[PDB]
């Protein structure tokens, strides 16, 4: 079968050939439909994040996948079920408490593999296998855009933890600020528009000149575009307002620290970005005083698990159809797979199509 | 009546005389028994925190008080009840949503007064009045050390919020690290020893040379003393272990940032210190990456409300008697009030006695 992989030393994704896998007991065989591409995949290709499987020359990419079950084997899945795989799997040493208690998303470094990212091959192959417990059934009609379920689930987890941090008092937020106009940030902005917390004012930070299709999406959602070149995060409360909820999706470390200054009293910032090393001079006193005297919280979040994927299927149905059309700028057949890794300003979310239902 | 106050421009606390107050409707008249002194009071005397009441030449100090009801007026309190007042009161402009919903501890700057700290006189007077709703009845036998209920309540709130931040997954901590060996830090260390979360290993950071009575208390609680001059917070995991829970009570901004490096995966730091301005070069990338990839949280907390004071009465009963004897290094009659504001290494928690039951 064909797969899309990065090879050690090499700079770009290439096609390789591998044998079709066979499911072991408790696993199903899945025929890949579509696999999404995101910022993390680019960071994996560049060497900034993740790592190869032990004793392998390559890493099959892709962690945002939707497929169809072709052989249920000895599982309770049915032939033709549409499934989305979770990303984390137990490491070489075997299972551990995080997997046994069904919270692998909380496992630390070295206690997991992430398919397509660290220590295990991803889903950009014609077929793959997975254990039934890591395959989430989704409604058949979400098959075409089912690669969005994984990134949606990322935000479902982040919101669960951020909101939990505010659960000891009566918190009623009205403003939300998304940092970053990538596919994760834009998806999250749309999710916040339909969130039960009832946000009245939405804002999204980027650094693009008009005309730009990410700006168009932000404004079409009735949100305000904030240009960080004009208004840095720390200055936002002077120009606009203090933000009850901040979701960071830039991977820029300055935003992790400065977000505290933009938060309203009793607010929380959720941090999702995978940053590079970076040192600078911080007013630590300002950071410290704001956190304490205004009862603020910062919560980091990575990965997601089954319940978050399930929640994502509900959120998906609430998203405007125009938004999903505008977000997904290209779905490319395997024959043109290279196009999916192009990253210019007009490329928002891409995917590679391996097969159709 | 006599009161202990700081006067504008002046450097030290002095005795002043004021008329005995009269309770309005819904208020009781309380005869002050004992009022504690803490780090915040010293910061108020120095001008680093708080502020005077509008149109007043002075501020009566003291926010940690226990008293006896002498006139219940038209309240449901009874003559002779032992009470501890809460600290926050509505500002000049009147009540607001935070007070109406019974969460004044969440009110931002300008939406509260704090008696003895900002905008309103404290409790270092022979008598004071308060609304019934802000007077917490405590068991009569806690009268002698009842000024500890307020600082205990501070930690009760901080723990509620920190633990709430971890409530979306199965968190079972085993290690806790208290930063600071002041009266708040030491009290909190003892509370953690009896906490239901079941901490096995306790640690407390200070910067004293032996012999020192704060070191003695830490070791007598079966905790490990960490000297920050030898082992800074960021290096603690190399020398000792990663900490599931960190409670910051130094007011040193470096600790607010560095605590993230000392946290175990999925851990939370609670920040309580009231810091001074301070800038330095931070590895922001390290901060950001740890928060995200290891699902960490930081929560700030200030003040406390009735439910926290109630909880404190239960915690009080669990604290070892030897510990309370060692923590309270002097209770001074009003005649020797100056002694209570002495701050040398051997002074831990002090109080001023105005009267006895
Ligand atoms: N925590 C998790 O489990 C998890 C899951 C998914 C993704 N992530 C991380 O989340 C981040 C976003 O993911 P993504 O797929 O949306 O990445 P992306 O497509 O690269 O989006 C990042 C966006 O941030 C913008 N940006 C960067 N610095 C900025 C600045 N200083 N001011 C304003 N905008 C700035 C970029 O704008 P320009 O294009 O103009 O440079 C870009 O559009 C990445 O770091 C990714 O690794 C984490
Ligand atoms: N959030 C709230 O509602 C609230 C409530 C109460 C108190 N607080 C704050 O909490 C903090 C502690 O209160 P407290 O009454 O316990 O104050 P404190 O008596 O002044 O105790 C602070 C302790 O921290 C130690 N310390 C300072 N810097 C250090 C460093 N770099 N390394 C190791 N130890 C260091 C000091 O040691 P040395 O004596 O050796 O200098 C001192 O013993 C203060 O900032 C106070 O304002 C906040
Ligand atoms: O993009 C991602 O990066 C994360 C870190 O590799 C991983 O945990 C998530 O499953 C994935 O969505
Ligand atoms: O020491 C304190 O400082 C806090 C800030 O002034 C105040 O809110 C608390 O009630 C008090 O315990
Ligand atoms: Zn992704
Ligand atoms: Zn106090």
Atom of ligand 1 nearest to the CA of A42: 20
Choose one of A49, A182, A236 to mutate for the ligand 1 pocket test, by most ligand atoms within 8 angstroms of C-beta: A182
Q: Is the dihedral of CA A179, A184, A186, A190 positive or negative?
A: negative
Determine if ligand 2 sits within 6 Å of the CB of residue B269.
no
Long-range contacts of A217-225 (CB under 8 A, 24+ apart): A217/A186, A217/A189, A217/A323, A217/A326, A217/A327, A217/A348, A218/A181, A218/A186, A218/A189, A220/A322, A220/A323, A220/A326, A221/A189, A221/A190, A221/A193, A221/A323, A222/A193, A223/A189, A223/A193
Between strands A127-131 and A27-37, the pairing is antiparallel
- CB neighbours of A346 closer than 8 A, spacing ≥ 6? A212, A213, A329
Extract the tokens encoding B110: 């300008």
Atom of ligand 2 nearest to the CA of B304: 3
User: CA–CA distance from B74 to each of B129, B133, B137, B279 (Å)?
Assistant: 13, 12, 16, 52
> Which of B164, B257, B279 minimises the CB distance to A165?
B164
Domain ranges of chain A: 1-168+302-357, 169-301
* Residue B27: strand pairing partners: B131
Give the residue from A213, A210, A233 showing the smallest Cα distance to A221: A213
Give the residue from A232, A293, A303 showing the smallest Cα distance to A266: A293
From which experimental method does this structure derive?
X-ray
Give the residue from A336, A334, A335, A327 showing the smallest Cα distance to A145: A327
Measured between beta carbons, the chain A residues lying within 8 angstroms of B297 are 161, 165, 297-300
Long-range contacts of A50-57 (CB under 8 A, 24+ apart): A50/A114, A50/A117, A50/A118, A51/A118, A51/A119, A52/A8, A52/A119, A53/A113, A53/A119, A53/A120, A53/A121, A54/A92, A54/A119, A56/A121, A57/A7, A57/A8
Q: What distance lies between CA A348 and its chain's CA centroid?
A: 13
Nearest residue (CA) to ligand 4, atom 10? B303
Residue B109, chain A, CB below 8 Å: the answer is yes
- CB neighbours of B330 closer than 8 A, spacing ≥ 6? B339, B340, B347, B350, B351
Residue B323, chain A, CB below 8 Å: the answer is no
* Cβ pair B220, B326 in contact under 8 A: yes
- Residue B296, phi then psi, degrees to nearest 5: -95, 160
* Cβ pair A183, A349 in contact under 8 A: yes
* Residue A60: strand pairing partners: A5
Give the residue from A120, A124, A61 showing the smallest Cα distance to A92: A120
C-alpha span between A283 and B232 (Å, rounded): 20
- CB neighbours of B157 closer than 8 A, spacing ≥ 6? B105, B301, B303, B304, B305, B308
Extract the tokens encoding A255: 């935003």
Nearest residue (CA) to ligand 3, atom 6? A117
| CATH architecture observed for domain B169-301 | 3-Layer(aba) Sandwich (3.40)
Give the residue from A130, A87, A289 showing the smallest Cα distance to B271: A289
| B158 φ/ψ sector (left φ>0, alpha ψ -120 to 50, else beta) | alpha
Cβ separation of A273 and B295 shorter than 8 Å?
no
At which residue do the structure tokens 């309240």 appear?
A: B75
User: CA–CA distance from A212 to each of A207, A251, A322 (Å)?
Assistant: 10, 21, 17
Extract the tokens encoding B294: 């290891």
Extract the tokens encoding B194: 């009896």
* Residue B98: strand pairing partners: none
Between strands B201-206 and B224-227, the pairing is parallel
Cβ separation of B292 and A285 shorter than 8 Å?
no
Give the burial class of A167: count Cβ atoms within 10 A of its Cβ; 0-12 exposed, 13-18 middle, 19 or more buried.
middle
- Residue A25, phi then psi, degrees to nearest 5: -60, 135
Give the residue from B148, B161, B109 showing the smallest Cα distance to B270: B161
C-alpha span between A237 and B274 (Å, rounded): 23
| B162 φ/ψ sector (left φ>0, alpha ψ -120 to 50, else beta) | alpha
How many other C-beta atoms are found inside a 10 Å radius of the C-beta of residue B57? 12
Cβ separation of B293 and A285 shorter than 8 Å?
no
Per DSSP, A213 falls in state H
Nearest residue (CA) to ligand 2, atom 47? B40
Rounding to the nearest 10 degrees, give the CA dihedral for residues A327, A330, A333, A335. -150
Fold held by A1-168+302-357: Quinone Oxidoreductase; Chain A, domain 1 (3.90.180)
C-alpha span between A311 and A324 (Å, rounded): 18
Interface A:B, Cβ pairs < 8 A: 183
| Alpha helices for A166-266 (secondary structure H) | 183-193, 213-220, 236-239, 253-262
The data reach a resolution, in angstroms, of: 2.0
* Cβ pair B145, B82 in contact under 8 A: no
Choose one of B46, B154, B180, B235 to mutate for the ligand 2 pocket test, by most ligand atoms within 8 angstroms of C-beta: B180
How many other C-beta atoms are found inside a 10 Å radius of the C-beta of residue B79? 10
| A198 φ/ψ sector (left φ>0, alpha ψ -120 to 50, else beta) | left
Give the residue from A11, A173, A285, A276 showing the smallest Cα distance to B251: A285
């Amino acid at each position: 079968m064909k797969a899309i992989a990065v090879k050690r030393g090499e700079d770009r994704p290439v096609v390789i050939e591998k044998p079709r896998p066979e499911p072991e007991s408790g696993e199903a065989l899945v025929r890949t439909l579509r696999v999404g591409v995101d910022g993390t995949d680019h960071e994996v290709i560049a060497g900034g994040h993740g790592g190869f499987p032990e004793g392998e020359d390559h890493l099959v990419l892709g962690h945002e996948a939707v497929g169809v079950v072709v052989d249920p084997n000895d599982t309770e899945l049915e032939e033709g079920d549409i499934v989305v795989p979770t990303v984390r799997r137990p490491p070489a040493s075997g299972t551990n408490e995080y997997f046994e208690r069904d919270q692998p998303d909380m496992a630390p470094d070295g206690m997991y593999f992430e398919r397509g990212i660290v220590g295990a091959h991803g889903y950009m192959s014609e077929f793959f296998t997975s254990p039934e417990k890591y395959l989430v059934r989704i409604p058949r009609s979400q098959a075409e855009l089912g690669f969005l379920i994984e990134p949606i689930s990322i935000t479902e987890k982040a919101l669960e933890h951020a909101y939990a941090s505010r659960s000891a008092f009566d918190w009623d937020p009205s403003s939300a600020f998304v940092l970053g106009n990538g596919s994760l940030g834009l998806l999250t902005l749309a999710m916040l528009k339909v969130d039960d917390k009832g946000y009245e004012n939405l804002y999204c930070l980027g650094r693009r000149d008009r005309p730009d299709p990410t700006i168009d999406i932000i404004e079409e959602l009735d949100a305000t575009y904030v240009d960080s070149r004009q208004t840095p995060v720390e200055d936002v409360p002077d120009v606009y307002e203090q933000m009850d909820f901040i979701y960071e999706a830039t991977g820029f470390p300055k935003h992790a620290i400065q977000s505290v200054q933009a938060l309203a009293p009793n607010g929380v910032g959720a941090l999702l970005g995978v940053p590079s090393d970076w040192a600078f001079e911080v007013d630590a006193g300002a950071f410290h005083r704001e956190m304490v005297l205004h009862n603020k919280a910062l919560v980091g979040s990575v990965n997601s698990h089954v319940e978050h994927f399930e929640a994502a299927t509900v959120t998906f149905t609430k998203l405007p159809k125009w938004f999903l059309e505008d977000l997904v700028t290209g779905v490319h057949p395997l024959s043109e797979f290279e196009a999916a890794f192009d990253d210019d300003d007009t490329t928002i979310k891409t995917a590679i199509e391996f097969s159709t239902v």
